[PDB]
Each structure stands twice: as structure tokens, then as C-alpha cells.
């Protein structure tokens, strides 16, 4: 019904505990029973991870079923034993709790920070995964230098999707920071792509974070309180080793972010406790008004011209899957000859075809143009 | 009391509960969930057919099923009833409106987020309730980590049928006015332990949600949720994620408050002109008015609400001052409206 795997030193001192059980209550019960039986004070152990793990592909949970965990424990100098064998017949999900000792926690925080560096991969750009005109790829190839960038985006190209398409690599980030009993969460299940777990650190793809002025609030750049002694780190702490993209941000925000990057760390006080956290990320600001930031200095500036008639026809044919006539280009407003305009036209034309059955596609395109123009 | 998945018929709640407990004890309670409760086999042809589709055989009613059957309904039987619900259709023949306004309003059939600059004071919810036909299936309630969330409410939903854990209803049309309602309608309000009331956008699944002069922050939150495709929340230490699917309409007379936000469709309804105003007056009053009365009424009254007010005043005057000609009554009503000029 349950199983416990314990990793301890050569002298028998238990330092790592992992518990598999059917549900949460049984897992908590067996964890506390194991803590009590071995004469271990609960305050010396900090809970690192907990949740439902998939055991669909595992017949049973034995020491011979966990090899990656054995290697991880061996690298730190701990050996692992089990109190029994758990049979996962007819079971898909299983609740699991992972806890480590506090002294091991601070040793990892202060001295063992360079142990799992043989897992990260250098970031690379693979531009073959996107279908874009050649000149735009040439202009956008400057993003591989990994410097702060300002993009005069007159083509309305969506930077976050492009970056998510052509970025490969892996980075290692702390799951959460326990500073003076105060817990700050950095790993985000919504914005980060899980790729592994190494005790108190998580291996993910290089983060890409997006912030739109017209859709998001400025409270995201502050330590938001979720629960008592449980806070959420600001956006620039969740872009550690990745990209932070700002769409039409205020000038003061960009100035503050540049000064924070220059200083190298963020200092604050929460509930009468001092917090200081280092900063490491890359900044992209994509705007259509470039003179708003005339005082600030950006090493890289990229300008994107609007789509021309030939390129607009090519992109429209690629997106719609049909060949539009040339005179179509004369019935659309000049400000709609962008990538976003093409996407809007595609969606509206698809819905029109789904409604007005039986009409030809050219008439549907003309009706969509009339609807857009009004 | 009669017991037939468990279905109990009884005269009162207490008898039904006692008989259900006795039946559960006799056959040798925690394995079942009461999914419905409140006010012959051949008579229940629909129930017999529904039980046959589940592989089984067949006042105050109680209806309960097992948790495993609940999971089977969630996963095995999530598309069996796509043949029982009709498609949403628009029929603009149930209302009498000018042609240039029906042509503009026909764009609502595309089912996209819309902003309506309503200078004609048209009643959007009444028009939509009049012209919309179809049926949809929505879950009666949602179970998430031993938490119950109410999705179906009797006041705002038009019942058409109940199929176990789901309800077939008319396409929902929810209306929210800034001056008349509170913002707690958009939060997971709690009534009793382990039972919560879903926000408005969860009770408008598959239908329309109309907002009247809403704040900008609420619109931003709704647009962000729609782009995300789901809502994530924390309740009593439990994380809950629920998908959302609805259409959003923002009715306003001050569109400059929503300049930054993006909507696929913008519909402008201009105020009535002389010809349309005369036509609407003739349609509603039941008499033919002359042209001079165009210059009597104040400009702001040349809308639909103004026409309704004029009709009410005309009916009152006709009730009071009997025997007079209708043109004189119309002129008197116009004089009363302007307060003697």
C-alpha cells in the first residue's frame, strides 16, 4: 500500500526520504510514522516536493526500478535503501513526497552549487523550424548574441511564438527559496516547461516570459503574497537564464529594469525579514513607438519593415491554403498588411466559410475584407 | 416509496431518505454520490432508454450514482449525447426591426467577442432571447478534489432535460449591469462547506455573456482568461483548473474607455433618423403620425427607449382624455415630454 526509500550516509544518518502511497492522508501518515520511528525531529526535515506521479509504465517500485535516483544519491555520497516492495498493478497515479535534511539543504545552497552542471546544454538557435521570408530571418538572426534588444516592430510579428519555436537548450533553476523561514516560489508550472528534477533544483527549457501592457498589471513585478509566509517571485526572477519580452511598456519600468540589471541583485524586506536575490536575464522590448525610449541605451536595435504586396500575397496564400487573386491587395487597408492582420483575416474567413456554406472562396475573402473595413 | 444507479420516488424527503438508507443497508453509502434530489416503468420510456444506453435495465425524486459510474460518464460517455442537442440557429423573423439594423446585428451569428456602441438604446438581452434557438448540454455541477462547484442554476437557465449528471438547456444568455450587480458574481463565492458557486463565465458555457458598462479591469481579466483557455485557482489549499468557453459582448455608449483592448467585431448603432423614427412610431403606436411631429420631440428621445416612453404616455393619455383625436393626443404627449417648452 506504501513504500519508503531512504538515502543515508555511511554512518547511518538519514538525509533523504521519498514516500510513495495511494493518497495524501496515507502518505502523510507513513511519513510521520517513519520520522517518529527513526528518532528524527520533524523540524530538521524540510519538504521539497509532493504530488501525483505517473506509475503507469512501472510494474513495481523497487531499488532496481529507480536508477536515476540511485545515481543522483551516489553523486552526493549517499546510499539508498528501501523498506519493502510496492506493487503498482492496475494503478496509474501515485502520491509521492520528497524531503531532504536542512543541513544538506544549506550545503547544496552554499557549497554543492556546482554538482549537477554536467546536465545543462548551451542554448542554440535553429531557424529552420519557421517559415518566414528570407530578409526577416536575416534581420532576426541578430538575436543569437544574447544582448538586450529593442525591436521596432512595424510588421506586427509575434516575438514570443517565434522564440518558443527556434530555441533549444536546458537551464537549472531553484524551485523555491526558503530565506529566514519565508518561502518564495520561482518555478512556475504555467510558464515553465518541466524537463527533470534534481532535489532542490529543476531542469527546464530556457524561459520565455511575455508581458503585455494592455492585458497585464504592474503588480507582477512585486512580491505577491499567495499565503502566509508563501510569496510569488516577480517576473524578472522567473526569467532567470532566459528572455523577458515587454510589449509597449512604460519608460520608467524599462529604466528600473536596466538599473536592476546593472546593480546585479534585488533587495527588499518582507514581514521584517531582509531578502537579497541575484538577477540574471535578457531583455527584449518590442514596440511600435521607438522615440519613447530615446534616453536609454540598448546594444542591439532591430527594425522590421511592413509587408509589401508580393510578400503579403505569399504569406496570405501560405496561411489560407488558397491562391488569392492579385486585385485582392487593393481592397485591404494599409494597416492590415501585417502578420497579425493575416491571422485575423484567416480566422474571420474560416468562420465565414463555416457559416455561409456554398459560396466561393473569393466572395468569402471579399466579404471578410468588407467586414474588416466596415 | 418506490426504488429502482439508484432512483427513489417518495411523497416527502424524509421518507425517501429513510427508504434509501434501508435499501443501501439491505444490499450491503460512501460509494455513491447523490446527483439529484427534490420535487411506472412504461411511463419512464426516456429513463428506460437512457439506462439501456448505459447497459442497465429499468412527487419527490432522489437520483444517485457511483463514483466509478461518475468517472465512466466523464471519460467513456463524454460524446455519446452529441446527437440529442440541436445546433444554435438565428431567426430574425421573431422581431420587428428596421432592415438597416437587422443587417448590422446579423454579425452576432459569427460567435466572436463583440463590442457594441449602442447609441440606439436597443435592448440586447431581450433581442437575443427572442431570436436565438438551439440546445446545449452543460454539467449540473463540477467535482474537483472533493470540492463541489455549482454550474447549473434554476433562475438563469431554462431547463429542457436532465441526463444524469448533465442538463440539456437553451443556450445561456447572462446579463450583468454595473449599477445593478456586484463583482462577487465573478468570484468563487462560498455558501456552505465544500459547495461553491461558480463565477458568471462558468455558468455561460456555450452561450453569451453581456456586460453593460463594465470596468476596464474586469474586461482585461476576462480577455486574459479567454486567451489562456482555462481558469486556475486555489481553494482551501487545493489547486483547481477548469476550462472555459463562452462568447463575450460588451454593450456601451462610451467606447473610449476600452481603446487599448482588442475585439474582433465592433458594431455601431446610430440614433434613429426622421424616416426610421416615423416608421417605428407608426409600428408601435398603431396610428399614422404626420411629419411635423418630427420637429416637436427633443433629439435625445429619438431612440427605442424614447419610443417606448412615448407609447406609454400616449396610452395613459388615451385612457384619461376620452373622445379626442389621436393626433391631438400625440401633440399633447409631446408637449408634456418637453415640459411646456
From TrEMBL, chain B:
<protein>
    <submittedName>
        <fullName>Uncharacterized protein</fullName>
    </submittedName>
</protein>
